[PDB]
Amino acid sequence: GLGIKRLAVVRLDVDDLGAAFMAGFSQQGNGQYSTLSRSATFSRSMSLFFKVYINQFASDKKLSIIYAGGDDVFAIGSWQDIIAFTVELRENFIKWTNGKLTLSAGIGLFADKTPISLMAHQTGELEEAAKGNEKDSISLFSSDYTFKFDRFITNVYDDKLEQIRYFFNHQDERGKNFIYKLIELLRNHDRMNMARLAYYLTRLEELTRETDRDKFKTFKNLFYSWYTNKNDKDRKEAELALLLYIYEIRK
Amino acid sequence: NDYRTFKLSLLTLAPIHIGNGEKYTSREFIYENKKFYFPDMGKFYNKMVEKRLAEKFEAFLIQTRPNARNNRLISFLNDNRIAERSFGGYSISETGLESDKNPNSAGAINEVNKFIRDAFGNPYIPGSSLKGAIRTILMNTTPKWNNENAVNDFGRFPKENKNLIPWGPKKGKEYDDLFNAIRVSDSKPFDNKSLILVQKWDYSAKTNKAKPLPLYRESISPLTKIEFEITTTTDEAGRLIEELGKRAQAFYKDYKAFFLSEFPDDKIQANLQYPIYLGAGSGAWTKTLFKQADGILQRRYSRMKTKMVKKGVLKLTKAPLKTSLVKNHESFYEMGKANFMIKEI
Amino acid sequence: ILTDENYVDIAEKAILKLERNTRNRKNPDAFFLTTSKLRNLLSLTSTLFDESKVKEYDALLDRIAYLRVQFVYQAGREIAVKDLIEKAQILEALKEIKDRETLQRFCRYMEALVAYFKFYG
Amino acid sequence: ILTDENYVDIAEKAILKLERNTRNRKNPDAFFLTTSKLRNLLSLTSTLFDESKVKEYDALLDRIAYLRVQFVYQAGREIAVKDLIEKAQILEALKEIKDRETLQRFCRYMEALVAYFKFYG
Amino acid sequence: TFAKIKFSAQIRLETGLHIGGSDAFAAIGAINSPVIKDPITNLPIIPGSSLKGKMRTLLAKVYNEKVAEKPSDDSDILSRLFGNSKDKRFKMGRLIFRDAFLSNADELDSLGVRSYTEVKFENTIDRITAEANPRQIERAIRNSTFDFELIYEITDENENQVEEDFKVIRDGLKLLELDYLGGSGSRGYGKVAFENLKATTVFGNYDVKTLNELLTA
Amino acid sequence: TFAKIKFSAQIRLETGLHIGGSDAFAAIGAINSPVIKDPITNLPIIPGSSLKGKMRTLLAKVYNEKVAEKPSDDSDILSRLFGNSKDKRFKMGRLIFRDAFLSNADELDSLGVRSYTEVKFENTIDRITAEANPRQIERAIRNSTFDFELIYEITDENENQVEEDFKVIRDGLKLLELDYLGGSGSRGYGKVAFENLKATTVFGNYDVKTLNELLT
Amino acid sequence: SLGVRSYTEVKFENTIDRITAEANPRQIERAIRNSTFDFELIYEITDENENQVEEDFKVIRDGLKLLELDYLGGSGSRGYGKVAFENLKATTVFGNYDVKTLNELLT
RNA sequence: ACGGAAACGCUUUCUAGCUCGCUAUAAUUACCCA
Incomplete structure (x- = not known):
């Protein structure tokens, strides 16, 4: 019963497949590789990935690839499997495409029995906001959560989410109210809220029991690191990590 | 039920003043009958x-x-x-021995510190008074609490450690808080006309003289009984209130040999029951740790009013006679020497 | 006179204005005023300061009218409190008691006097 | 001084600049000033800061100078709070109360002071 | 059916209670620890929250078989009277403890009382060097009364447990005169009585006459 | 006809009320659980959702003859009165619970009241280790009034529920004169008292002469 | 000048379950009190309507006398209404029909 | 003779449930000043 009754919709887009098709290899060399055979082989490779291989990445995961191919993937499904499917799709696409042609996905949460052309429009809006971020970005649950994928899976979905999950699994004082207040302090965030968070973590530091106390001490040392990191590249990441954890433990 | 109540009853051998801070100043009373008046x-x-x-x-x-x-x-x-x-206002009677060698001066006194009164106008004795009196006895008569009630290397002979007795939440332990199991309740409001305004009378050491002081605190008329409800819920403070019947005489005995010796026993009272010292003028040794503040208490007084040498000057009073409780002439009482008996009810 | 925004400063520049011990030159420029002789001044006011909140001022004016005589009397017993009441115009402020808010303002002004005396020496 | 954006760092290195338990190294780098000698001050600013959002500025200006009374007073009792108001320019920023907004900003500065005071041990 | 009954008592003080007041703009040489107060009339009142939290520990000293270590671990004879925070059907608590107001303003003006509070100097004598450290903790006066209201529930889920919890509630009423209603405790501050019990059903059909046997006896 | 009827009433507080509000992270020493206030005037507001949902959960015990697992499972004495989400004809359910915005302030400032919301202190003491844990919660002051009103609309859809609904709502008002209506009630907050339950037919051919003889 | 930060407040709310007694909080955003909005309603008069034009003007006025007794919004059975019109005049805009037969009936 | 006519993002929902302003604390100390 842990997890929220959602359905997430990802619409990928290959970042400038028109420019990667028309110019593409012609950047390299003196026009030595500006041939037709390489372009046909590359487009058949895109066909073989986006038109066959998505049924391999979606095999165990529970979703529905509605449309795929060319430079678009519209895949509806359940949100843990959708996020893990985007994770595996890019983390084997950059193994497939050597890190070149970064894909710009957009994943929106939608409630139960909400219509789909209402939903495809918002997914496309998050998709184009992820497009215009830079060359590539993920847009997660709203256009203000816009990270690079190289920042999203490594920092949030590999480092931060596992620390956050293990920290709240192996303790039972700090339940969900503490996570909600951490999300709110991550979201408002003026200069004074860093002082309020430095008060909050330190006031909870001497309130946990003595046995599992230094877990909280290293976690507040590791949390005030990214909260006051003065970059805003390590802050909305942590807010999204806590949102993913809360949505994973929803009763 | 683990709430082990007691009952402490307090006879007044001595003038007993407590509290309330405020006073009636020099030009603030009326003496036209033999009764002082404070409107x-x-x-x-x-x-x-x-x-x-x-x-x-x-x-x-x-x-x-x-x-x-x-x-x-x-x-x-x-x-x-x-x-x-x-x-x-409230009228009170006169002492009679209020002033020395001042004919027709039964009214030329200056400062009367008030006794503690509630909003009704009827004076009582609060349980904080008896608990502060109890804490010095139960501190001096237990040897584990007498060693390091000292400097803590924080200032210039500052204060007690305040940590020899368990105190507070103590986050991570059980409920310790030893003195919470001595619930010294406040006395019942007695009659208004049991006040005498005794003068402080200094009896100097190394100078056989009875130099008095111009501060006449409103004390309690002698030989009056006082009720006190005292409950206990923890076994250690319960045993301390059980052992009060030894610790009171033990503190008074070791305080007599420390302080009350070399001074003549004519003016010093007799016990006749369980002795105790209540507040406002009984000397700092009845309010502190007597074998711990040898040079530490008197170090502060480097002023126009220094304690003679080491130890405080003997403090006496002047109040009339009933029954004797004075054991000499000229009515030098002892200002706070009360009596009590205890019984678990 | 004193109002809501100046009564600290009324008690600020008056405290630097009082004389000090020109003689007795050990820790010099110490106040002739001592702390007990100012707590005897404040302890009259601070009971009425909290009686004002429960009661009303028209059921209270008699005690401030007598408190006038109390400040006169404490001024009449020393060379410092006779100096204090006019170098810091407490007897001037005691003539204007017009409502309970001004009464509490005067009590806070007395508290400011005690605070700024405790701030020095 | 205190603006809308600079006050948190002010309170930060007004907590840092305060001197600590140098003698008697039993958990050293700990403040001589006690936290209950800071929360008794901030319980004034909190009852301003949340009763400022209900009221005017010009209805609050009785308690606003009483803040300058109590900061002077509690600075006068311990040497630690006098050290605090020398490091943290509290009385120099109480002149900078001209409206509801800068009063709430100063109360946020006081909250930053207590927050960083609790932060270091 | 659904009934709802009322327990009215008079908290008559003996050497009354200091429940920490609100305003920090206190004093210099006056009250620096006031009592809680009804701010329209500045009356010291007894809130129901101190009553509930006192009766929680006072009845957990009796009816707990297990040690607590926390709230939301009471022994379920109290957890339907004071509520759990965790038990699935016992989030509510069915006991409403209304704030007791000081009633006898009329008779206590006949008694020569200036104002309905007092200032009780309660200094801390230093156990070495004998120096003083005064406090003026304000308490309600010695013989005020308070209208301790109380409201109990009756549903179609309380067959016989209406009378099961009454001698649990009356255990609180005659153990509140064993403890001190919040305050400082060991300096008096809480000894009280509960005069004029008049228990009736303010809502719903329930009997008042066979109900009136175990309350005062 | 079409008969909209306005139920003018005076919510007078006693044992002053607290409704919750922004538990978004407030200042450090300030109020932890602030009351919800109308943002124009900053007076306390008792919103209609507290009144309607609280009277819903209290008329659950009174007029649901069956036990109700959820407010969709209210009977057809309450589904027509408080609305229902799954019933066929009981959506848009005839009662617009209007709010009240602390009607008297010229009276409550004529009495010497500084602020209309007191900040009462509270804490908790665990039974083991007896550690304290303090809090400052906001409440409205004691003797406040609140100009509260209902809107009952009769569209000639009932034609028999003229007094089949006011014995329900009047006894619900009696329940709220007994029960807490808002916030930490079992510690003794809220306790509204309903005064002058003045019905007036603001639209329709109707008389209150058969109404206020029951509503007193 | 009344003094408010943003004209949209967040009324917090919840859903206490009837048996489980577990809440379920909401952040319902509203527009704050006594905001006055521009409201204009173009009635158009043809020759066929000219019999009952003045009759219909006792319906639109009656349509706003009832909208001050109903919510005019959503989730309005818990408040969120009482929406009161003001300055309810009747001007004329490119049409030579006198509005002096109407303005005493509306205002 | 307007991709236009007809169309309320609407119905239901208590910011709630639990929580002692608590823990230690004699208005006291000293003997004088012309």
Whole structure:
């Protein structure tokens, strides 16, 4: 019963497949590789990935690839499997495409029995906001959560989410109210809220029991690191990590 | 039920003053009968402004006048015939031995510290008084609490450690808080006319003299009984209130050999029951740790009013006689030597 | 006179204005005023300060009218409190008691006097 | 001084600049000033800061100078709070109360002071 | 059906109770620890929250078989009277403890009382060097009364447990005179009585006459 | 006809009320659980959702003859009165619970009241280790009034529920004169008292002469 | 000048379950009190309507006398209404029909 | 003779449930000043 009754919709887009098709290899060399055979082989490779291989990445995961191919993937499904499917799709696409042609996905949460052309429009809006971020970005649950994928899976979905999950699994004082207040302090965030968070973590530091106390001490040392990191590249990441954890433990 | 109540009853061998801070100053009382009177001075002034002589009342209060029989507002209330005595207030009787070698001065006293009174106007003794009296006895009569109630290397002979006794939440432990299991309740409000305003009387060491002081605190008339509810819920403080019947005489015995020896036992009272020292004027040794503050208490007094040498000067009073409890003539009492007996009910 | 925004400063520049011990030159420029002789001044006011909140001022004016005579009397007993009441115009402020808010303002002004005396020496 | 954006760092290195338990190294780098000698001050600013959002500025200006009374007073009792108001320019920023907004900003500065005071041990 | 009954008592103080007041703009040489107060009339009142939290530990000293270590671990004879935070059907608590107001303003003006509070100097004598450290903790006066209201529930889920919890509630009423209603405790501050019990059903059909046997006896 | 009827009433507080509000992270020493206030005037507001949902959960015990697992499972004495989400004809359910915005302030400032919301202190003491844990919660002051009103609309859809609904709502008002209506009630907050339950037919051919003889 | 930060407040709310007694909080955003909005309603008069034009003007006025007794919004059975019109005049805009037969009936 | 006519993002929902302003604390100390 842990997890929220959602359905997430990802619409990928290959970042400038028109420019990667028309110019593409012609950047390299003196026009030595500006041939037709390489372009046909590359487009058949895109066909073989986006038109066959998505049924391999979606095999165990529970979703529905509605449309795929060319430079678009519209895949509806359940949100843990959708996020893990985007994770595996890019983390084997950059193994497939050597890190070149970064894909710009957009994943929106939608409630139960909400219509789909209402939903495809918002997914496309998050998709184009992820497009215009830079060359590539993920847009997660709203256009203000816009990270690079190289920042999203490594920092949030590999480092931060596992620390956050293990920290709240192996303790039972700090339940969900503490996570909600951490999300709110991550979201408002003026200069004074860093002082309020430095008060909050330190006031909870001497309130946990003595046995599992230094877990909280290293976690507040590791949390005030990214909260006051003065970059805003390590802050909305942590807010999204806590949102993913809360949505994973929803009763 | 683990709430083990007691009952402490307190006879008053001595003048006993406690508390309330505020006072009636020099030009603030009436002595025309043999009874002192304290009206409400605001009520007195607001009724006296109808007599319209209040401007002279401005000059009467700053009047530096010798032969102080005309200083203490009897002259304002007999020289200009305002002698109504309807001012809201409470009358008390006189001591009789209030002043020494001052004929017709039964009223030229200056400062009367109030006894503690509630909002009704009936005086009582609060349980904080008896608990502060109890804590010095139960601190000195237990050897584990007498070693390091000292400097803590924080300042200049600052204070107690305040940590020899368990105190507070102590986050991570059980509920310790030892003195919470001695719930010293407040006394019942007794009669208003059991107050005497005894003078502080210093009896000097190395000088056989009885030099008195101009501060006449309103104390309790002698030989009056007082009720006290005392409950116990923890076994250690319960055993401390059980062992009070040894610890009181033990503290008084070791305090006699530390302080009360070399001083003549004519003015010193007799016990006749369980002895104890209550507040406001019984000497700092009855309010502290006597074998711990040898040079530490007296170090602060480097002023115009230094304690003679080491240890405090003996403090006595003057109050009339009933029953004797004085054991000499001229009525030198001991200012706070109370009696108690205890029984679990 | 004193109002809501100045009564600290009324008690600020008056405290630097009082004289000090020109003689007795050990820790010099110490106050002739001692702390007990100012707590005897404040302890009259601070009971009425809290009686004002429960009661009403028209059921209270008699005690401030007598408190006038109390400040006269404490001024009449020393060379410092006779100096204090006019170098810091407490007797001037005691003539204007117009409502309970001004009464509490005067009591806070007395508290400011005690605070700024405790701030020095 | 205190603006809308600079006050948190002010309170930060007004907590840092305060001197600590140098003698008697039993958990050293700990403040001589006690936290209950800071929360008794901030319980004034909190009852301003949340009763400022209900009221005007010009209805609050009785308690606003009483803050300058109590900061002077509690600075006068311990040497630690006098050290605090020398490091943290509290009385120099109480002149900078001209409206509801800068009062709430100063109360946020006081909250930053207590927050960083709790932060270091 | 659904009934709802009322327990009215008079908290008559003996050497009354200091429940920490609100305003920090206190004093210098006056009250620096006031009592809680009804701010329209500045009356010291007894809130129901101190009553509930006192009766929680006072009845957990009796009816707990297990040690607590926390709230939301009471022994379910109290957890339907004071509520759990965790038990699935016992989030509510069915006991409403209304704030007791000081009633006898009329008779206590006949008694020569200036104002309905007092200032009780309660200094801390230093156990070495004998120096003083005064406090003026304000308490309600010695013989005020308070209208301790109480409201109990009756549903179609309380067959016989209406009378099961009454001698649990009356255990609180005659153990509140064993403890001190919040305050400082060991300096008096809480000894009280509960005069004029008049228990009736303010809502719903329930009997008042066979109900009136175990309350005062 | 179409008969909209306005139920003018005076919510007078006693044992002053607290409704919750922004538990978004407030200042450090300030109020932890602030009351919800109308943002124009900053007076306390008792919103209609508290009144309607609280009277819903209290008329659950009174007029649901069956036990109700959820407010969709209210009977057809309450589904027509408080609305229902799954019933066929009981959506848009005839009662617009209007709010009240602390009607008297010229009276409550004529009495010497500084602020209309007191900040009462509270804490908790665990039974083991007896550690304290303090809090400052906001409440409205004691003797406040609140100009509260209902809107009952009769569209000639009932034609028999003229007094079949006012014995329900009047006894619900009696329940709220007994029960807490808002916030930490079992510690003794809220306790509204309903005064002058003045019905007036603001639209329709109708008389209150058969109404206020029951509503007193 | 009344003094408010943003004109949209967040009324917090919840859903206490009837048996489980577990809440379920909401952040319902509203527009704050006594905001006055521009409201204009173009009635158009043809020759066929000219019999009952003045009759219909006692319906639109009656349509706003009832909208001050109903919510005019959503989730309005818990408040969120009482929406009161003001300055309810009747001007004329490119049409030569006198509005002096109407303005005493509306205002 | 307007991709236009007809169309309320609407119905239901208590910011709630639990929580002692608590823990230690004699208004006291000293003996004097012309």
